[PDB]
Amino acid sequence: VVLRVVTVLEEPFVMVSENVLGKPKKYQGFSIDVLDALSNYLGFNYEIYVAPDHKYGSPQEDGTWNGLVGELVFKRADIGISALTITPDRENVVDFTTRYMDYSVGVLLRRAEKTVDMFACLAPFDLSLWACIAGTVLLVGLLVYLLNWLNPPRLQMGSMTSTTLYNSMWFVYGSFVQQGGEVPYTTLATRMMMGAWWLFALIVISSYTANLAAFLTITRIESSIQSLQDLSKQTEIPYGTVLDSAVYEHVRMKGLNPFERDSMYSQMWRMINRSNGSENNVLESQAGIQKVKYGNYAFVWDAAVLEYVAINDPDCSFYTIGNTVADRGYGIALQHGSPYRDVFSQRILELQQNGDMDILKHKWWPKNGQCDLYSSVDTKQKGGALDIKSFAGVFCILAAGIVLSCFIAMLETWWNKRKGSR
Amino acid sequence: VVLRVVTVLEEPFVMVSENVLGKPKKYQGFSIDVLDALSNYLGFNYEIYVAPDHKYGSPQEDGTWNGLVGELVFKRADIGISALTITPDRENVVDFTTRYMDYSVGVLLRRAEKTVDMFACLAPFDLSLWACIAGTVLLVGLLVYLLNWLNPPRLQMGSMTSTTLYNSMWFVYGSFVQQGGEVPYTTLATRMMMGAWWLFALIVISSYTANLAAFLTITRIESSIQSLQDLSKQTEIPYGTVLDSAVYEHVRMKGLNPFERDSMYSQMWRMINRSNGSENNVLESQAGIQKVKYGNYAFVWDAAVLEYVAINDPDCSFYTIGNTVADRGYGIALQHGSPYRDVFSQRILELQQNGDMDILKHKWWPKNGQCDLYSSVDTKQKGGALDIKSFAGVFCILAAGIVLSCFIAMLETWWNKRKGSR
Amino acid sequence: VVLRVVTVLEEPFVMVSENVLGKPKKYQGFSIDVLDALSNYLGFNYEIYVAPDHKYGSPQEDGTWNGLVGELVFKRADIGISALTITPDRENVVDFTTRYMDYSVGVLLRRAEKTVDMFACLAPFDLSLWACIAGTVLLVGLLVYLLNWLNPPRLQMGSMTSTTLYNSMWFVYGSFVQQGGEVPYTTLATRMMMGAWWLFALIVISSYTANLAAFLTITRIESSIQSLQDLSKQTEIPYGTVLDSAVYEHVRMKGLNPFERDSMYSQMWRMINRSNGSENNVLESQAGIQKVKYGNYAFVWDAAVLEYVAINDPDCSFYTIGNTVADRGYGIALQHGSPYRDVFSQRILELQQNGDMDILKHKWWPKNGQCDLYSSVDTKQKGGALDIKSFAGVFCILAAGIVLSCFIAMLETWWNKRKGSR
Amino acid sequence: VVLRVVTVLEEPFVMVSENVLGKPKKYQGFSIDVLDALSNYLGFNYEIYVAPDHKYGSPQEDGTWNGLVGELVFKRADIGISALTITPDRENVVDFTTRYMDYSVGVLLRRAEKTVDMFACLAPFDLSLWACIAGTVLLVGLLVYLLNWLNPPRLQMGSMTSTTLYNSMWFVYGSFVQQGGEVPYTTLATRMMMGAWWLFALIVISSYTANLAAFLTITRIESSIQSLQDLSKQTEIPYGTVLDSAVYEHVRMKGLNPFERDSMYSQMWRMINRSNGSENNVLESQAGIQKVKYGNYAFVWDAAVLEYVAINDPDCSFYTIGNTVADRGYGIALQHGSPYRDVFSQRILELQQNGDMDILKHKWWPKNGQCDLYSSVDTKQKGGALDIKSFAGVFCILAAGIVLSCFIAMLETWWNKRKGSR
């Protein structure tokens, strides 16, 4: 048996890899691997040639088709295999096998260095717990003050050991922060209160040290943006696609429908459509990829392609997010009424369900390698010292207290100049 | 136009909707909704009947086929629709439409919460060790007074600075909790004693801070069960499936793969195969589900079914997880060479392209479900701060000390109402 | 082509798979997989039977051979394949192929090394570092005392605040353990001294807390005892082998040579030979394995067999050591002058260099599984809480200080008979 | 008896040792010692000549064998012995003996300076952050006095009832380092500022303890370069091999064969094959060794050769690592059908199992080498305690304060011997 195959060049599905007299002598790629795995079982010989316009094709105004589909409609080639997308407008004129790989829409994003968070000091306790602690300090100072009046100590006559609220609360704060000398309160009530206060304070400060020790070990390669929803919700990074591409038309026709209400699609179209699409789109996939590599941009394209580029960019400078996608799958096209639809399909099924196809897929999309596709940090950082940019928040907390001491010292003489009441 | 449809009664896909004289008269389901969405465009009415042996079908030893597949091979019906998974042995005897819904092996699990322990401050030391420490405090506080009996310093006569029976405890406590200030001991025996007590206290406090920090830093385990690649690693929960099922055979096939790097399937098989599979497997899906409900068990089945179970459980007690087990999907099957195959595939694709298949799917797997189906907060716990409700034990220890020292009014305010006077 | 194969039953190399009509008609195993990999490429048919005495054989007193080698010498079978070990006295009568897998002598042990230890909290600093710290404390107290002689401050004559050597040393210690009151040193020199001492003290106590936290965090992971030599250095765990086995003779022959560059084999033999071998050894491999499983014992045997037992023990209660061994290997024996020697050796080399043999090897010796084969510890830890057994050392340090306070209170009764006065 | 021997020079297997009339009279090396250990038993003498093209090369495109093999194929010599490695290309045309030594792909590396670093306590904070903290102390100590100048307490002026210029620093420092006693300030602004300072102090000290603990716990993991898996998983040190070598071909085969389900060899190939392999690779083994010795490079070759280099390197500058490798080994090769194959194989096995081969091998790879060649990291325990040599920085920080205060005490002896008063 002899078969003539039409293809379109696209990495990593179909590439030329040897040339003689300027003509392609060898093809390779995942779709070529599928074709060869079919040939080695069914025994057919194949001759591959490249479609002249390098387009998949569209229904012409006369009802014909151009491109690879055209080459099938005119029956100039027997079988067409490439990064086709199974769609019913195409199947209306040519047959398709069962899909051998699921299609998906992905985005390519440049990696970035870890941000310097400003308030690493506040992290160990939830931002409401500090309000609970400050309120507990105040309430314990009030409880100490009422305690000293419900049951009073016995004291030196006229001594300031009859501690006013101000002096009573000072001991509660100072003892909380592990400062100050002997607590002057001798009575069993006040001691029994202060010793449990000391136990609370020491447990709080241990827990602070212990949980700061945990952010200083968790902080690793985990931080990333990992969904289309997030990309559609943020606005700092512009995103787009190739103009008039099937991806463009897909995202458009998803987003324009007002009865579809997953707003991610409409937010994507609302970004893409700006200035007739000229704001965020590019003429070519390579231009988009380079714009991502050397600018603030993200490129929306075939997830399989972008994952292949991210795996085979030697810098690991890109990262990418994956998505579960239906309605589309790569497959093999045939002339309408061709019998091999009922010959290839069962072998494609055997390959998928035996797991044999997983070898051919791994051969081009390796499960592990140099580049961790779903992680985006300065991965060289095992750990580090605390920088001035980092610990800034605590110098701010101090400078705020300093400001409040300057305010009070300045104000106390607007008090002192009240009425002459020295 | 009239077409004869064979079906198999199966959860969501095909279920009864009307009964007369105790017998079913009509059917409903997601597959029924797809069949009607086709019929209302193509205009054909249909007959439906349940296959006489109530199973999808299998090849006989004579090479014929039983079940609904048998009913298609013998041309007893025009069209077959059910949860009929596409497989190559079936495509060798019947023709399949393009797959309209994706297959997936999933698991049903009972919830167990991510909430922090009520008393997480107790964790660093065993409840018996806290008792030993408290007793050691009380011992040192008694010993210090028996030591001070033999060895009085040449104190000033009648000075309040004398080592009273009472303050001896208060110094040993306030020193242990790192707050005591100066200790008025000058003889060698008791400077020795307090110095060794300060060493013991500092070592205890450091070990508390350290093993709280380690108990916090151990936090990774919240991520331990979120996919089959993770469920295949744990061993606390045994998992299994229905015996003689296509799911069991699939687990067997992928587990016996000589070269698959995804050892997940091998670790599944290493548990499922125990005692010829009789240890962990069940004969009924409802038996599996309710064994998970009433005991420590995990049921492995079609994720499409298990998500419906998780949605419709009136207690919302379950959650479910399902990996990207692709390369299979549900399809409508037809007799060899039936011309409706291409027109059906055409319209099924047009339905998926429009998103009409998403709208239909939402009728049976509502995305905005009545209750949570997947999470008990996300991985955020593997990166969270110390919330109020995690610390609450320490506020109870403080509240207990407050309430005790307030109840010291019921000792001392009553008593000093009766000791003569205030 | 038809060839007659003799084998000997041994797991997992050669095993029966069904007692068809009560006879061992069907066979399975690693060497059966090798035999099939040969047969499928070379096309020869084969027949298998089991040697009558289930022994490999020995050179008889008449110069004949019994066992499988006998069955080759008598030309009763064409091929001998088993867990047979290539040796030159065997090669003296039958030819061997290239060895397809390297032999090894290994040891099987139950999991051991309970994680309970008493000086756990003393470990963060090296044993000499505590001597350095206590020396630095003493030297700093001496340097403070000599510093205070060069110039005195504006003291108060005869006041209790005066700083002799004894008070100076006490201030230095109490300020180190963070229990000191106000330091009375006003002079710029002695202030600068105490302030640098305070900075040293904070850095010591922080480093202690940090390294104790690290040791608690990382302990229990690494395990210990993973070498045959060091397992032969100790004697608390008895070890042995099957009497008169090839392992026994091998260890004897190694150990009895005093000119060997390592005494370790003599240290093995001087254990194995005890009570004429009856002290340790066992009659059967299964009896050895059970004696290990239910007693304090270790069994020395074919490492691949012990590894297969450890892998297939459902409890995974054993662990084993993958000792590097040479000079021996498993191979295929043949009648002298058989032409298949070259054909088999050629195909074995092809299978080895291609890596195809590793597919057959991993099928029986899985490189990964639900448990680690080399981890040896009885972990016993899930909560990580500290207990009375572990923290014992610090109560001992306190009890030693208590003892010395008691002895000093007693001692201030012996001088005190004789002081002149108190 | 005489047999002609042919060899290829390769250290340390075969080298020249004497020359007469410009022709090689004697040879030396481990393979020469094996050849002599055979000859002295079998009694045959030999003449050794070097093969004219000095390579093991694969056969010509016409199927004739060049190289050391060709001299056997054409029966030009009787025995071939060299670093010739048994491979399936060769036993098809010549007869191999059992391999007398195992083959192994190894790597040569240069060991580190063992990091004599005193910064172990400087690590938690950046070297500029310590300057910022010191400046912040000096500011707070100056501000406290410029605050106290505005508003004093209602107490006697000109005495310690008002804040002194000097003690302000001593309170701010001693409160920062927790040894502060009781701060004497009682006005609102100064209790406010000291309270904020105590909060800043606690936050700083806790962050120091935490990030020391994180630096210690991120250390005591990441020092693991001890195997080809570790060296291939890392990407910080580049590695390469000699082109046109069986080592490169082996890395190519294991890297491209998809059934090698271990990532190690794939990531080896992905490093070595940079820039068409022209980037990392070399044309000479000496060039590799020198590139390791004088640059950041690792050289992949025969572990026997690299370990011989590591042993003989007079500087002890190298270290070496080698994988547990099989499927190849060095062997003695003979003319096809030569009868001596059996007698040689027998005697080689006798030498191996007697341990005579260990004694011979020790002549060229001595165990008691002049250098430590087997680890890139310390042999300390799995946890690692803090030590004198790591803490030495803090004892230097203390020594600086000692020396400074000892100097100040000797300046003071001018001031009061020069005023005549304190």
DSSP A356-409: HHHHHHHTTS-SSSSS-TT--S-TT-S--PBPHHHHHHHHHHHHHHHHHHHHHH
* C-alpha span between D208 and D386 (Å, rounded): 17
B261 contacts chain D (CB < 8 A): yes
Compute the nearest-CA separation of C224 from chain D (Å): 9
The residue among D229, D210, B210 whose CA lies nearest residue C219 is B210
Chain A residue with minimum CA distance to D262: A368
Q: What's the CATH class of domain B223-325?
A: alpha beta
How far is residue C141's CA from residue C135's CA, in Å, rounded to a whole number?
A: 10
Domain borders along chain D are 1-102+327-374, 119-219, 224-325, 388-422
| C-beta of residue B262 within 8 angstroms of C-beta of residue B229 | yes
Which residues does chain C have within 8 Å of residue A181's beta carbon, measured at their own beta carbons? 181
- Which residues are CB-contacts of A195 (< 8 A; sequence separation ≥ 6)? B173, B174, B177, B401
Q: Are strands A239-240 and A298-302 parallel, antiparallel or unpaired?
A: parallel
Which one of A181, A203, A349 has the shortest CB-CB distance to B86? Answer: A349
C205 touches A: beta carbon within 8 Å: no
Backbone angles phi, psi at C221, to 5 degrees: -85, -45
Say whether residue B405 is in contact with chain A using an 8 A CB cutoff.
yes
What Å distances lie between residue A360 and A29, A351, D251, CA to CA?
9, 10, 21
Which among D310, D305, D276 is positioned nearest to D293, based on CA atoms? Answer: D310
CA–CA separation, C395 and B200 (whole Å) = 8
Q: Which of A209, A212, A216 has the most C C-beta neighbours within 10 Å, making it the best mutation to test the interface with C? A: A209
Residue B353 tokens, joined:
């392209």
**Rounded to 5 degrees, what angle do the CA atoms D342, D344, D345 make?**
65
SS3 at position D299? strand
* Residue among C13, C42, C40 at smallest CA distance from C28: C13
Task: Out of 1.10.760.10, 3.40.50.720, 3.40.50.300, 3.40.190.10, select the CATH number for domain D224-325.
Answer: 3.40.190.10
D36: left (phi over 0), alpha (psi -120 to 50) or beta: alpha
A189's enclosing H/E stretch is helix A188-218
Round to whole Å and give the CA distance between C360 and C29. 10
Contact partners, residue D47, CB within 8 Å, separation at least 6: D2, D4, D5
Secondary structure of chain C in HEC code, one letter for each residue: CEEEEEECCECCCEEEEEEECCEEEEEECHHHHHHHHHHHHHCCEEEEEECCCCCCCCECCCCCECHHHHHHHCCCCCEEEEEEECCHHHHCCCEECCCCEECCEEEEEECECCCCCCCHHHCCECHHHHHHHHHHHHHHHHHHHHHHHHCCCCCCCCCCCCCCHHHHHHHHHHHHCCCCCCCCCCCHHHHHHHHHHHHHHHHHHHHHHHHHHHHHHHCCCCCCCCCHHHHHHCCCCCEECECCCHHHHHHHHHHCCCCCCCCHHHHHHHHHCHHHHCCCCECCHHHHHHHHHCCCCEEEEEHHHHHHHHHHCCCCCEEECCCCCCCCEEEEEECCCCCHHHHHHHHHHHHHHHCHHHHHHHHHCCCCCCCCCCCCECCCCCCCCECHHHHHHHHHHHHHHHHHHHHHHHHCCCHHHCCCCC
DSSP letter string over A252-311? HHHHT-SS---HHHHHHHHHHTTTTTTTT-BSSHHHHHHHHHTSS-EEEEEHHHHHHHHH
Instruction: Answer for the pair D239, D107: CB distance below 8 angstroms, yes or no.
Output: yes
Closest residue in C to A178 (Cα–Cα): C178
- Cis bond upstream, residue B52 (ω within 30): no
Transcribe B317-357 into DSSP letters: -EEEEE----S-EE--EE-TT-THHHHHHHHHHHHHHHTHH
Residues in C closer than 8 angstroms to D212, CB to CB, are: 206-207, 210
CATH number of A2-103+330-338: 3.40.190.10
Identify which of C382, C369, C360 has the alpha carbon closest to the alpha carbon of residue C32.
Answer: C360
Distance of CA B218 to the CA centre of its chain: 19
Q: What is the rounded CA–CA span in Å between residue C19 and residue C31?
A: 19
- State the virtual CA torsion across C229, C235, C236, C237 in degrees, nearest 10: 60
The 10 Å Cβ neighbour count of residue C55 is 13
Structure-token match 């690493």, residue found: A120
| Closest approach of B35 to chain A, Cα-based (Å) | 18
> Is B16 in contact with B24 (CB distance < 8 Å)?
yes
Question: Which residues, in sequence order, are CB contacts of D102 under 8 Å at separation 6+?
Answer: C102, C326, D325, D326, D329
**CATH for C108-115+225-327?**
3.40.190.10
CA atoms of D211 and D204, how far apart (whole Å): 11
So what's the architecture of B2-102+331-356 in CATH? 3-Layer(aba) Sandwich (3.40)
Q: CB of A160 within 8 Å of any CB in chain D?
A: no
Q: Provide, as residue numbers in chain C, all residues whose Cβ is less than 8 Å from the Cβ of B123.
A: 383-385
DSSP letter assigned to residue A224: -
d(CA A53, CA A67): 6
**Tokens describing residue D9:** 């020079």
Instruction: Tell me how crowded residue A305 is: count the other CB atoms within 10 A of its CB.
Output: 19
H or E segment at A96? strand A95-96
> CA B336, CA B72: separation in Å to the nearest integer?
9
Q: Which residue of D has its CA nearest to C331?
A: D98
Nearby residues of A203 by Cβ (< 8 Å), 6 or more positions away: B121, B394, B397
CB D91 within 8 A of CB C342: yes
Cis, peptide link before residue C12, omega less than 30° from 0: yes
The reply to whether C216 touches chain B by the CB within 8 Å rule is yes
Could you tell me the two tokens for D239? 């590695």
- Eight-class DSSP state of A49: E
Q: Given a contact as 3+ CB pairs under 8 Å, which chains touch A?
A: B, C, D
- Could you tell me which CATH class the domain A107-113+225-326 is placed in? alpha beta
CB C206 within 8 A of CB D212: yes
Which neighbouring-strand residues pair with B5?
B48, B79
CA distances, B306 to each of A10, B112, D218 (Å): 40, 18, 42
Spatial separation of the C-alpha atoms in residues A382 and A370, rounded to whole Å: 17
Please provide residue A229's backbone torsions phi and psi, each rounded to the nearest 5 degrees: -60, -50
CA contacts within 13 A on the Cβ side of C375 = 13
The C-alpha atoms of residue A387 and residue D125 are separated, in whole angstroms, by 7
Give me the residue label for tokens 């108060």.
C156
Chain A: give the shortest CA distance to residue D12, in Å. Answer: 37
Q: Do D207 and A212 touch (CB under 8 A)?
A: yes
Q: What are phi and psi of C125, to 5 degrees?
A: -110, 140
- Return the residue in B85, B119, B179 with the most chain A beta carbons within 10 A, the one to mutate for interface testing: B179
Q: Distance of CA A236 to CAs A223, A231, A271, C24, Å?
A: 17, 9, 12, 73
Q: What share of chain D is helix, strand, coil (3-state, %, to 5)?
A: 45, 15, 40
Report the sign of the C-alpha dihedral through residues B247, B8, B284, B309, in that order.
Answer: positive
Closest partner residue to B91 (CB to CB) among A124, A193, A349 is: A349
Contact with chain C for residue A181, Cβ under 8 A: yes
The 8-class DSSP code of residue A27 comes to E
Cβ of C257 and D355 within 8 Å?
A: yes
Cβ <8 Å between B214 and C209 = no
Q: Which residues on C lie below 8 Å from A213 (Cβ)?
A: 213
CB D307 within 8 A of CB D45: no
C386 with B126: Cβ contact below 8 A: yes
Ligand-binding annotation for C284, yes or no, is: no
CB D210, CB A123: distance < 8 Å: no
Class of domain C2-103+330-354: alpha beta
For an interface test with A, the pick among D194, D203, D221 (most A C-beta atoms closer than 10 Å) comes out as: D203
Residue A394 C-alpha, separation from nearest chain B C-alpha, in angstroms: 18
Measure C418 CA to nearest chain B CA, in Å.
16
DSSP state of A249: H
In what helix (H) or strand (E) does residue D231 lie, and over which residues does it extend? helix D228-233
Alpha-carbon separation of residue B371 from B306, B323, C278, C362, D361 (angstroms): 15, 21, 69, 46, 73
Report the residue count for chain D: 422
**Strand locations in D208-350, DSSP E?**
239-241, 298-302, 318-322, 329-334
Sort out which chain C residues have CB atoms less than 8 A from D327's CB and list them: 349, 352-353, 357
How many angstroms separate the CA atoms of A210 and A253, rounded?
Answer: 53
Residue D15 exposure: Cα atoms within 13 Å on the Cβ side: 7
**How many angstroms from the chain centroid is the CA of residue D44?**
46
Helix and strand totals (H; E) in chain A = 14, 13
A354 φ, ψ to 5°? -75, -20
How far is the C-alpha of C28 from the C-alpha of C30, rounded, in Å?
7
b/e D279-303 (16+ beta carbons within 10 angstroms → b) = ebbbeebeebbebbbeeebbbbbbb
Query: A115-218 in CATH: which number?
Result: 1.10.287.70
Secondary structure class of B417 (helix, strand, coil): coil
| Alpha carbon distances (Å) from A193 to B232, B284, B404, D55, D102 | 52, 62, 8, 90, 76
Interface membership of D326 toward C (CB under 8 Å): yes
Annotated binding-site residue? C317 = yes
Query: Amino acid letter at B95?
Result: D
- The CA distance from A402 to A405, in Å, is 5
Please list the helix, strand and coil fractions of chain A in percent, rounded to the nearest 5, in that order: 45, 15, 40
Q: Are D365 and C390 in contact (CB under 8 A)?
A: no
Least Cα distance to A181 among D236, D124, B178 occurs for B178
Provide, for chain B, the percentages of residues in helix, strand and coil under a 3-state DSSP scheme, each rounded to the nearest 5. Answer: 45, 15, 40
C384 touches chain A (CB under 8 A): no
CB contact under 8 A, C91 and D181: no
Q: Measure the CA–CA gap between A413 and B70, rounded to whole angstroms.
A: 101
Q: Which of D95, D186, D172, D107 is nearest to D140 (CA)?
A: D172
Sign of the dihedral defined by the CA atoms of residues A115, A121, A124, A125, in that order: negative
Please name which of C398, C137, C201, C166 lies closest in space to residue B191, comparing C-alpha atoms. C166
Considering only alpha carbons, which residue of chain D is nearest residue A397?
D200
Q: Is C261 left (phi over 0), alpha (psi -120 to 50) or beta?
A: alpha
Compute the distance between CA of residue D201 and CA of residue D141 in angstroms, rounded to an integer.
14
CA separation for the pair A253, A268 (Å, rounded): 11
CB-nearest to C209 from B183, B197, B206 is B206
Closest alpha carbon to C238 in C276, C279, C275: C279
The dihedral sign for the CA sequence D401, D406, D409, D413:
negative
- Supply B207's token pair: 């070990």
- Least Cα separation, residue A336 to chain B (angstroms): 10
Domain D1-102+327-374 has CATH 3.40.50.2300: no
Q: Are C243 and C287 in contact (CB under 8 A)?
A: no
The reported resolution of this PDB entry, expressed in Å, is 3.7
CATH number corresponding to D119-219: 1.10.287
CA atoms within a 13 Å half-sphere pointing along the CA-CB vector of A405: 25
Q: Which residues of B touch A188 (CB under 8 A)?
A: 408, 412
Q: Do B402 and A207 touch (CB under 8 A)?
A: no
| A326-to-A36, A91, B88, B99, D13 alpha-carbon distances in Å | 27, 17, 21, 10, 63
**Three-state secondary-structure class, residue D143:** helix
Tell me if the bond preceding A238 is cis, omega within 30° of 0: no
Tally Cβ neighbours within 10 Å of residue B365.
Answer: 15
Q: Do D342 and C202 count as a contact with CB atoms less than 8 A apart?
A: no
A331 within 8 A of A86, measured Cβ to Cβ: yes
C-alpha A311/C-alpha A304 separation (Å) is 11
| B332: CB partners within 8 A, 6+ apart | B34, B35, B79, B80, B81, B96, B97, B100, B344, B348
Residue B357 near chain A (CB below 8 Å)? yes
Instruction: Identify the DSSP state of D177.
Output: T
The alpha carbon of A67 is separated from its chain's Cα centroid by a whole number of angstroms, namely 37
Cβ atoms of A256 and A249 within 8 Å: the answer is no
Domain B118-151+163-219 has CATH 1.10.287.70: yes
User: How many angstroms separate the CA of residue C266 from the nearest CA in chain B?
Assistant: 42
- Domain B118-151+163-219 in the same topology as domain B2-102+331-356: no
Distance CA(B368)–CA(B250), nearest Å, equals 32
**Cross-strand bridge partners of residue B103:** none
List, in sequence order, every residue forming a beta bridge with B387; answer none if it has no partner. none
Cα distance between residue C103 and residue C179, in whole Å? 65
Q: Is A213 on the interface with C (CB under 8 A)?
A: yes
Residue B222 among known ligand-binding residues? no
Tell me the shortest Cα–Cα distance from D261 to chain B, in angstroms: 6
Question: Is B254 within 8 Å of A355 when comparing Cβ atoms?
Answer: yes
Q: What are the structure tokens assigned to C285, written together?
A: 């491999």
User: How do strand C105-110 and strand C45-50 relate by DSSP bridges?
Assistant: unpaired
Contact of C202 with chain A, judged by CB distance below 8 Å, is answered with no
Positive or negative CA dihedral for A296, A300, A301, A303?
Answer: positive
Residue of D365, D318, D308, D361 lying closest to D11 (CA atoms): D308
Residue ranges of the binding site of D for Ca(2+):
91, 94-95, 313, 315, 317
The CA distance from A5 to A7, in Å, is: 7
Q: Is A403 on the interface with D (CB under 8 A)?
A: no
Please spell the DSSP secondary structure of B64-101, one letter per residue: -B-HHHHHHHTTS-SEE-SS-B--HHHHTTSEEPPP-E
Mutate to test the interface with A, among C178, C183, C209 (most CBs of A within 10 A): C209
CA-based nearest residue to A227, from A311, A168, A298, A282: A298
Nearest chain A Cα distance for residue B295, angstroms = 33
A317 annotated as belonging to a binding site for a ligand: yes
With CA atoms as reference, the chain D residue closest to C323 would be D324
Check: CB of residue A405 under 8 Å from CB of residue D147.
yes
- Longest Cα–Cα distance of chain B, Å, equals 120
Among residues B206, D208, D214, the alpha carbon closest in space to that of C214 is found at D214
Find, among B145, B252, D406, the residue nearest to C144 by Cα: D406
Chains near B with 3+ CB pairs less than 8 A apart are A, C, D
Tell the residue number behind the tokens 């022709």, with chain if given.
Answer: D23
Structure tokens at B249: 């055979």
